[PDB]
């Protein structure tokens, strides 16, 4: 469950992660602008062009959609029954299915689809270390507030390096407690809530040991702070990063022009 990246050789995989994460954020912003059917059509053609331009199968996108498909349809039906107007089908005491209700439900379904599809492309088509590097790059304007961004990047990098380690530790700890009788899925509310201490307290003890050991190792190896350091793993712009800015400038014009204002 740790790994979500699926390898490929399409140009989307060669796009800089700073460009891809900016394009993801900008696509969310352009989804905010869609109000009429022309804007929803434009944002859907652009999102599906991105999705088909990744070359991925529909099953990885369906796996991205699967956990919240019931949330999607519940929100879509709730928008169907609230903004109802015009025609009437299958009328009830308060529930009224309408033409305007169905198009508003289609709009919110399209928004759920385009949000999830574009964010799935971000997760699947670039490596997690690269996403971390892009996020460190986007935290650079926080330097204007004298926030130690290198400290933030160090904390992020250590957390990412130690999630799979501490997940293995969590599974090991839970197996060790279950071997001497712990149940983590039975008992009622108080018994379930007491059962997370045999999981969390060894996890926190292990985290304290790792924190002391890793800080000791970092200070031994000459880490005196984030300032005055060089970078081994850099991100480099290239010519394929002009495709996201053409994709975003063209999307902006059609978003502004085609929307009903």
């Amino acid at each position: 469950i740790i790994g979500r990246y699926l390898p490929g050789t399409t140009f989307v995989y060669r796009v800089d992660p700073r460009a891809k994460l900016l394009t993801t954020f900008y696509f969310i912003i352009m989804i905010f602008l869609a109000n009429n059917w022309v804007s929803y059509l434009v944002i859907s053609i652009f999102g599906l062009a991105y999705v088909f331009a990744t070359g991925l199968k529909a099953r990885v996108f369906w796996d991205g959609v699967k956990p919240m498909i019931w949330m999607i349809v519940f929100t879509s039906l709730l928008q169907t029954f609230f903004m109802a107007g015009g025609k009437v089908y299958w009328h009830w005491w308060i529930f009224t299915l309408s033409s305007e209700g169905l198009i508003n439900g289609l709009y919110v379904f399209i928004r759920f689809a385009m949000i999830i599809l574009v964010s799935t492309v971000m997760t699947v088509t670039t490596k997690p270390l690269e996403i971390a590097d892009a996020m460190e790059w986007m935290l650079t304007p926080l330097k204007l507030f004298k926030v130690n961004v290198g400290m933030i990047s160090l904390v992020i990098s250590i957390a990412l390096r130690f999630v799979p380690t501490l997940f293995d530790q969590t599974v090991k700890i839970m197996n060790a407690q279950r071997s001497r009788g712990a149940d983590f899925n039975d008992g009622g509310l108080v018994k379930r809530a007491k059962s997370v201490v045999p999981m969390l307290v060894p996890l926190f003890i292990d985290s304290l040991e790792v924190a002391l050991d890793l800080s000791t190792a970092m200070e031994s190896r000459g880490y005196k702070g984030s300032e005055g350091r060089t970078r081994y793993r850099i991100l480099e712009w290239s010519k394929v990063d002009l495709i996201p800015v053409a994709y975003c400038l063209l999307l902006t014009i059609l978003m502004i022009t085609t929307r009903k204002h």
């Binding site: 919240m68 574009v118 996020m135 957390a159 501490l166 997940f167 969390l200 304290l208």
Partner: protein, 169 residues
């Protein structure tokens, strides 16, 4: 003000919060995620401000290695930051008390889950605020009490480690 040992510990608690946010409990009818436990460790061990930083960074880390399920939006980063900040307002450097646990879970539920996460859903999916709230009201009127009971027992678990020799500070 935060040394390298405390920085690496903050990274550990962020990793713990991400891992716990992947965990769920309860029967098939009622699934409760465990990320609030990481929020409570962030606020209890590091305070409101480093709890805020840890919650935002935990949202970023979990987005990196599990995909940000809602989308890619910094409003959810703000909400994930605001949770541990409230837990640090109510529980940092304080004795363990029933009212503090109850009030912290209520304030996190109302401010973050009921209030602001509904605002981001209505902003992203273009629906009215009441529609998003009715889409989210039923889970967030059941999970606060489960979270109160769980957070209560988390706090003696975290306290007995802080009073041990393993806690350097």
């Amino acid at each position: 003000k935060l040394e390298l040992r405390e920085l690496v510990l903050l990274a550990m608690v962020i990793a713990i919060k991400v891992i716990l946010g992947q965990f769920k409990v309860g029967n098939a009818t009622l699934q409760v995620g465990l990320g609030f436990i990481g929020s409570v460790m962030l606020g209890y061990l590091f305070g409101p401000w480093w709890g805020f930083a840890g919650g935002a960074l935990s949202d970023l880390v979990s987005s990196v290695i599990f995909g940000n399920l809602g989308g890619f939006f910094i409003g959810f980063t703000l909400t994930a930051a605001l949770g541990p900040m409230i837990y640090g307002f109510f529980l940092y450097k304080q004795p363990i008390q029933i009212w503090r646990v109850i009030a912290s879970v209520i304030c996190v539920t109302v401010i973050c889950n009921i209030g602001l996460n509904t605002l981001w859903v209505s902003m992203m999916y273009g629906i009215n605020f009441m529609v998003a709230l009715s889409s989210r009201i039923l889970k967030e009127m059941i999970t606060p009490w489960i979270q109160m009971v769980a957070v209560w027992f988390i706090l003696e678990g975290l306290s007995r480690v802080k009073l041990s020799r393993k806690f350097w500070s």
